[PDB]
Amino acid sequence: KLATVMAIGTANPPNCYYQADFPDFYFRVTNSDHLINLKQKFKRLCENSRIEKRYLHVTEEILKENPNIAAYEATSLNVRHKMQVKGVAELGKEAALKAIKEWGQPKSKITHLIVCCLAGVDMPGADYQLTKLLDLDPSVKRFMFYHLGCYAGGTVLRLAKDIAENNKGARVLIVCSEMTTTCFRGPSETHLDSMIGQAILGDGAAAVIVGADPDLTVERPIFELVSTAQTIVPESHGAIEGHLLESGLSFHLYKTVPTLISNNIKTCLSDAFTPLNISDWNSLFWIAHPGGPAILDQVTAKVGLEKEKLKVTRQVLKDYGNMSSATVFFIMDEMRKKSLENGQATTGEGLEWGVLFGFGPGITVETVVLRSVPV
Amino acid sequence: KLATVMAIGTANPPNCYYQADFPDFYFRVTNSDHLINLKQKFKRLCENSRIEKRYLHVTEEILKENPNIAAYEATSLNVRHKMQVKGVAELGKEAALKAIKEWGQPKSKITHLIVCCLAGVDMPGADYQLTKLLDLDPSVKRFMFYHLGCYAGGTVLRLAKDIAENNKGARVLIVCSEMTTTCFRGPSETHLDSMIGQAILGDGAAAVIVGADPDLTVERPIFELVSTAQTIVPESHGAIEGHLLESGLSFHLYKTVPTLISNNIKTCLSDAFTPLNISDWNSLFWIAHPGGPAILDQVTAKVGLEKEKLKVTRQVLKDYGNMSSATVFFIMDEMRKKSLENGQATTGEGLEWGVLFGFGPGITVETVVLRSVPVI
């Protein structure tokens, strides 16, 4: 009896930013219009991001109220955290309620709560906050993960799988609430990669309910968690880093990331699927963290995937941008929705087996083998 | 087959601070010798702490180089984190190596790594650093917990239990590496919370190996993880809070913390032990996070524990102070050591069943039911 995803709910801040207008907005609110060459670089980052829009808690008003946030490097952790701590909770609450609704069981049946937040360190944490906000059982078993990064969607599933499978009747609520208020900052001519964060990172929360042995008279499985794995890409040291400083969470991304990830994907696939006697990567449905269009293009090319295999993944990137750990669940959600609309037999675009990838600091790759459920 | 603790290793910074001399040290290195009145309150704080010594990464030299850390509140997070990130990994590595040695298996057999650090946020984190430092399998399945606090000893065991029992052959290395460099700060007349942490918090790391179905020809069980629970103490909102600020980590505890926790213990005991048909709290061996001397006194009093029940717990507090999440493992380690020296029948002071408690922000209480193992 495999751990099974039985519900997915998502939420995003109400402020929508169309990518086509972001360069002008970003350079204006960060008083960087005098940096003509830097603006062209940023403009191109946005144009090549393959992101059409994003939802952000940050607004021009908030930046006016907090100039130290608009600055590339200014003491601002305190003001960022004040907003971050509240934002991840409220956004996570919205997503959790939607997940709980789809799940179909009363929230009192939630036995475990896993919360994952890029930033917003607080003691007690967002897990405690959500327990109070959702009025969950005070004895709900919680796990709180701060600062894991973009591979965390796989991490929370890896955890949920073992919890669900080792505890009869366990019903795990996962909440990945990602807010970039702690990362949002002005551009730097000396650290050109920092602004990549403002070109691709969006806000969003995803909640999922995971449990083994579904009560088919009320619960409705979406995807089964077959196996999970995590690995560190060889010779990838320092390619993706984030430091929590007095100026908030930094963003470091080396130009080698796309090739490092794409060149190692087949190994992750082989390790995960050889045990299942599966070698045709195109026979799987794909849910890959859209760290960037380069990663997706290179993975598609190097793995030998058909052009549209990552269609849903690319669509989510286009509609919401990179929402860190929550992204893969938006993709998972949209995939089962599109599968239904396209009249396909399974939640995985009609295919039986699938793979979910999380990519992040390490470089770390989380590989989750999934099995679809009939539509 | 229950997840089983098969090894425990510990480590502490090389700088030992005797509590009897800390008041003078503290106010001296923080240029607070002029605050005679406040110095008296701190001296009293340390005297009733029941802590004889602590090991800290901070030194007079470090404070002289970083006066912004010595100040009660000054933009100093960057300098703090630089040391914190390095410290937790180095201290964690030492404890891990010791645990691995006791375990008796090649480190290549480690399948999962759980790292827990009060502070030292970094991406990638301490789990990544330790994987590299210990040269563990690149595919080791890692879990990294930052800023959980003092109940985390139970949290990591609760996690390790499910990992080990749901994955045949899984061998989990847990590393709780706690350093207080991020929360060390000078005294302030307009503040009276952060001063308590300066008197009770110590540095230290503990590592343990957890696995189900031990290979008895090489592995040697110490304690079995029977059940785990986590709960939020009723009407305790805001009682224990910690915030990571530009001035580092700051804690604020209501004076009611000891009472809130102690009054809730019997409930945790009942929930965890009624299913095992156990009701005599003195029939269990005890491992309780020594948040402070008050918590130990009130738990003993309200629960009705005989004087020797928290002996090891109190001894660890006396010898190391409050080392956050790592503490319960120092206690677990010392308990089986003393049990052996006392020629007792089990690793749990000759008793069969035991309980490990973690107390922290929430207020959160982690309750782990333990089973000792026979000792020849």
- In terms of Cα–Cα distance, which of B214, B115, B103, B95 is closest to B160? B115
A369 has which bridge partners? Answer: A227, A355
Structure tokens at B293: 């001397």
- DSSP code per residue over A12-70: --S-EEEGGGHHHHHHHHTT-TT-HHHHHHHHHHHHHTT--EEE-S--HHHHHH-HHHH
B92: helix, coil or strand? Answer: helix
Q: Note the maximum CA span of chain A.
A: 63
Cα torsion B293, B295, B301, B307: sign = negative
Q: Report the residue of chain A nearest B271, measured CA to CA.
A: A139
Chain breaks in chain B (C to N over 2.5 A) after: none
Q: Topology of domain B222-374, per CATH? A: Peroxisomal Thiolase; Chain A, domain 1 (3.40.47)
Which pairing describes strands A353-360 and A364-372: parallel, antiparallel, or unpaired?
antiparallel
Collect all residues of chain B within an 8 Å Cβ-Cβ radius of residue A165.
166
**DSSP character at residue A114:** E
Tell me how many helices (H) and strands (E) chain A has.
Answer: 13, 14
**Residue B151 and residue B289: Cα distance in Å, rounded?**
8
Collect all residues of chain A within an 8 Å Cβ-Cβ radius of residue B122.
147, 242-244
CA dihedral A281, A284, A289, A293 (to 10 degrees): 60
A202: helix, coil or strand? Answer: coil
Which pairing describes strands A112-117 and A171-178: parallel, antiparallel, or unpaired?
parallel
Name the residue among B123, B228, B230 with its Cβ closest to that of A149: B123
Is any Cβ of chain B less than 8 angstroms from the Cβ of A31?
Answer: no
Quote the minimal CA–CA distance from B343 to chain A in Å: 36
**Residue A78 and residue A182: Cα distance in Å, rounded?**
9
B235 alpha carbon, distance to own chain's centre = 24
Q: Report the residue of chain B nearest A141, measured CA to CA.
A: B230
**Residue A148 and residue A315: Cα distance in Å, rounded?**
24
Peptide bond into B240 cis (omega under 30): no
Contact B354, B331 (CB under 8 A): no
**DSSP character at residue A142:** E
**Residue B155 and residue A127: Cα distance in Å, rounded?**
13
State the method: X-ray
- In terms of Cα–Cα distance, which of B342, B285, B296, B350 is closest to B318? B296
Active centre residues of B (catalytic) = 150
**Residue B166 and residue B159: Cα distance in Å, rounded?**
11
Cα torsion A208, A212, A217, A221: sign = positive
Q: Topology of domain B1-221, per CATH? A: Peroxisomal Thiolase; Chain A, domain 1 (3.40.47)
Q: Do B1-221 and B222-374 fold alike per CATH?
A: yes
Structure tokens at A206: 């995803």
Collect all residues of chain A within an 8 Å Cβ-Cβ radius of residue B228.
141
Q: Report the residue of chain A nearest B233, measured CA to CA.
A: A138
Collect all residues of chain B within an 8 Å Cβ-Cβ radius of residue A128.
232, 361-362, 364
Domain ranges of chain A: 1-221, 222-374
**At a CB cut-off of 8 Å and minimum separation 6, what does B61 contact?**
none
B353-360: strand order across its sheet? B141-146, B112-117, B171-178, B204-211, B4-11, B223-232, B364-372, B353-360, B285-288
Contact B232 A139 (CB under 8 A): yes
Q: How would you write chain A as a 3-class SS string?
A: CCEEEEEEEEECCCCEEEHHHHHHHHHHHCCCCCCHHHHHHHHHHHHHCCCCEEECCCCHHHHHHCHHHHCCCCCCHHHHHHHHHHHHHHHHHHHHHHHHHHHCCCHHHCCEEEEEECCCCCECCHHHHHHHHCCCCCCCEEEEEECCCCCHHHHHHHHHHHHHHHCCCCEEEEEEEECCCCCCCCCCCCCCCCCHHHHHECCEEEEEEEECCCCCCCCCCCEEEEEEEEEECCCCCCCEEEEEECCEECCEECCCHHHHHHCCHHHHHHHHHHHHCCCCHHHCEEEECCCCHHHHHHHHHHHCCCCCCCHHHHHHHHHHCECHHHHHHHHHHHHHHHHHHCCCCECCCCCCEEEEEEEECCCEEEEEEEEECEC
Question: How many inter-chain contacts (A to B, CB under 8 Å) are there?
Answer: 145
A16 has which bridge partners? Answer: A55
Contact B364 A145 (CB under 8 A): no
